[PDB]
Design a protein around this ligand. Structure first.
Ligand SMILES: CC(C)(COP(=O)(O)OP(=O)(O)OC[C@H]1O[C@@H](n2cnc3c(N)ncnc32)[C@H](O)[C@@H]1OP(=O)(O)O)[C@@H](O)C(=O)NCCC(=O)NCCS
Ligand SMILES: CC(C)(COP(=O)(O)OP(=O)(O)OC[C@H]1O[C@@H](n2cnc3c(N)ncnc32)[C@H](O)[C@@H]1OP(=O)(O)O)[C@@H](O)C(=O)NCCC(=O)NCCS
Ligand SMILES: NC[C@@H]1O[C@H](O[C@H]2[C@@H](O)[C@H](O[C@@H]3[C@@H](O)[C@H](N)C[C@H](N)[C@H]3O[C@H]3O[C@H](CN)[C@@H](O)[C@H](O)[C@H]3N)O[C@@H]2CO)[C@H](N)[C@@H](O)[C@@H]1O
Ligand SMILES: NC[C@@H]1O[C@H](O[C@H]2[C@@H](O)[C@H](O[C@@H]3[C@@H](O)[C@H](N)C[C@H](N)[C@H]3O[C@H]3O[C@H](CN)[C@@H](O)[C@H](O)[C@H]3N)O[C@@H]2CO)[C@H](N)[C@@H](O)[C@@H]1O
Lengths: 265, 266
């Protein structure tokens, strides 16, 4: 009853994961079953399937609970400024909400982490250095982001037992969509620097809620569901977890058209 | 209401943690309260209290589920041998049973991890290399082990909200105790090599149960309780967690004498 890196790789190949793919994974490890090496079995299986020319990616985000202390302009009060732990791409943990896997991937020797804290991705493999390079600090889900590079690279996204609304790539569709009423987030971010802490104001479309009013919180799952229903994407089991595999460029264009059809002109 | 690295260091100083100390920590991080930097707040506070001359240590162990497959001699079935992930001191996770802190410390840049998988410790600070170097693979809780070095260096053990029965150092007292009937655990451990997996049999006194028959599972808690009752050690709050701080040499000698009184003949 032990799932192994060999058995999971066979499940991944049957689902459609291909040699040389850049694969981004959102996993609910508790639904995969008994794993011989725990969550690292999934990372090893993904690397075995894509090979040294492929890349394994996950959404890291940043564990930064100082967000509760900020005012309405997103500023940290001066009495708290020197206590907020600054962002270090090599030492800052991945956010706990994303699950154990993004942190397990981040601490795998050889994995790189991009510089935009809230929008940061981890990448391990051939194009990891390119995926994590030059992440724009403002609107880090847009044109120069790792998510845009995932579309650029013809990559794929694997929902490994995770609820479909956790597909981070659809925030990149939210960014691109020509629709009105886009919600905006502004927050002060501390950055670790060799000379001390450097504060910077960050502006981006708010990803803590749907980009526009009139949408349910988990509305991403409805887009993925309709994307599967249109005959695109693949569904199957990875271990014991019902999983979904989608093409990054196709789902992004679907999401952009989905938003621009319902909202705006 | 956010526990911070400055506030936790103040709690640690009030408990007795001193500049330059080598401190081994057993933590129940959920009891510390709301932390501004999560579990890393505790690690940063410990480093701030001991300073650059001090060292922060935790019991890492090893997350290795293949023990369920072993036969009656502790041997791995041949059809499973090449599938068991081998031990890598830099890549093998800390065991999940020990809590989030040992894994967070292990993955902090600057931390080293010793080579005995089941008994491995992590160390961060001045003596991290000395604490984790040349960990004997057999009887990895005895002579020349990181636990013996913690005693050698006059280090301390911090129970940060953790149950007193998780004090790993008392396994070093179990090893040293001159008592009969000591149970021995022997199991196959895979070691990572460039050429594949290298299997080795590991022999040690069994630390999954009391060293001798007739003892309760949490009997370590009884030793610390009696150790505190004798007027030794310090008690206090670290954040919101009731904590205990003890001298590594004192608790070890207390534990050895405790076992040699109940069991063993002069
Ligand atoms: C939130 C979410 C992760 C919860 O699902 P989950 O399976 O319960 O959480 P995890 O993915 O961390 O998997 C937990 C399993 O991993 C294993 N695990 C967790 N920590 C472990 C550790 N230190 N050591 C070994 N194994 C561990 C365990 O098997 C655990 O199962 P258990 O708690 O039942 O014993 C999932 O619903 C989800 O949304 N995933 C997508 C995340 C994402 O990418 N989000 C983007 C922003 S929304
Ligand atoms: C078993 C034991 C760890 C359980 O105590 P615990 O506090 O509930 O578990 P942890 O120490 O891992 O800390 C949990 C807290 O850490 C935080 N945490 C856990 N994972 C986190 C993550 N990825 N990111 C940020 N914070 C995290 C959370 O605050 C979590 O609280 P929550 O799970 O209620 O939300 C504790 O009782 C114990 O025995 N500690 C000593 C273990 C030891 O060293 N044993 C050696 C021989 S037995
Ligand atoms: N949900 C209501 C809103 O939540 C905000 O905080 C939210 C925010 O920190 C964080 O949101 C994070 C963002 O950061 C990150 N950049 C992308 C990520 N997908 C998103 O995640 C959130 O949206 C997903 C749906 N795609 C959900 O699956 C997920 O459970 C949820 N945490 O989770 C918190 C709660 O979801 C604010 N508190 C406030 O704007 C309002 O309360
Ligand atoms: N206790 C009963 C026995 O437990 C064994 O497994 C045990 C073993 O793998 C493992 O034991 C681990 C050892 O590894 C490790 N080298 C030191 C560590 N202190 C110890 O931990 C154990 O003993 C502590 C008390 N010091 C307890 O606080 C802790 O809850 C317990 N997990 O946890 C399991 C539960 O203790 C066997 N299943 C079987 O021989 C029998 O059931």
């Amino acid at each position: 009853s032990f799932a192994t890196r060999t058995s999971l790789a066979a499940d991944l190949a049957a689902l459609g994961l291909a040699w040389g793919d850049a694969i981004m994974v959102h996993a609910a490890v508790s639904r995969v079953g008994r794993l011989l090496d725990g969550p690292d079995t999934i990372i090893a299986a993904l690397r075995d399937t894509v090979g040294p020319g492929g890349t394994v990616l996950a959404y890291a985000d940043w564990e930064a609970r100082y967000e509760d202390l900020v005012d309405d302009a997103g500023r940290v009060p001066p009495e708290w400024r020197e206590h907020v732990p600054p962002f270090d791409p090599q030492r800052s943990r991945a956010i706990r909400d994303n699950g154990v896997l993004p942190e397990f991937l981040r601490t795998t020797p050889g994995t790189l982490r991009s510089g935009n804290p809230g929008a940061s991705l981890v990448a391990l493999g051939a194009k990891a250095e390119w995926f994590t390079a030059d992440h724009p600090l403002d609107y880090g889900y847009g044109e120069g982001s790792p998510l845009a590079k995932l579309v650029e690279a013809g990559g794929k996204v694997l929902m490994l037992g995770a609820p479909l609304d956790t597909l981070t790539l659809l925030h990149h569709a939210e960014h691109l969509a020509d629709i009105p009423g886009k919600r905006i987030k502004r927050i002060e971010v501390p950055f670790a620097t060799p000379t001390g802490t450097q504060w910077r104001m960050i502006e981006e479309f708010d990803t803590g809620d749907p980009i526009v009013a009139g949408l349910a919180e988990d509305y991403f799952a409805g887009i993925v569901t309709e994307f599967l229903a249109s005959g695109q994407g693949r569904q199957g089991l990875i271990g014991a977890a019902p999983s979904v595999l989608v093409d990054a460029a196709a789902i992004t264009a679907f999401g952009v058209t989905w938003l621009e059809k319902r909202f705006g002109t």
